[PDB]
DNA sequence: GGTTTTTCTCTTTTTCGACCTCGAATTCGATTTTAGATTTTTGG
């Protein structure tokens, strides 16, 4: 790297909140497919 | 009258209590800008 210079995060950051989601249902069981991903 | 056996309590284990208690994770209402429109006022 010959130039390096320092710049702010969201001037080329794209951020936003999620699709609203009620995936909250009866069963969700392994025999399901989707990969629910938390903290 | 004495000895032995059985039982009862007291000493020590031991196993339960529509629980409970710490780490991890977090959905709805409360509240705010912006999008925008409509109405009113001022200027030409």
Not at 2 to 7: C, F, G, Q
């Amino acid at each position: 790297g010959v130039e390096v210079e320092w710049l702010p995060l969201g001037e080329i950051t794209k951020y936003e909140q999620p699709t609203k989601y009620l995936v909250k249902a009866k069963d969700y069981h392994d025999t399901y497919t989707i990969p629910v991903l938390t903290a």
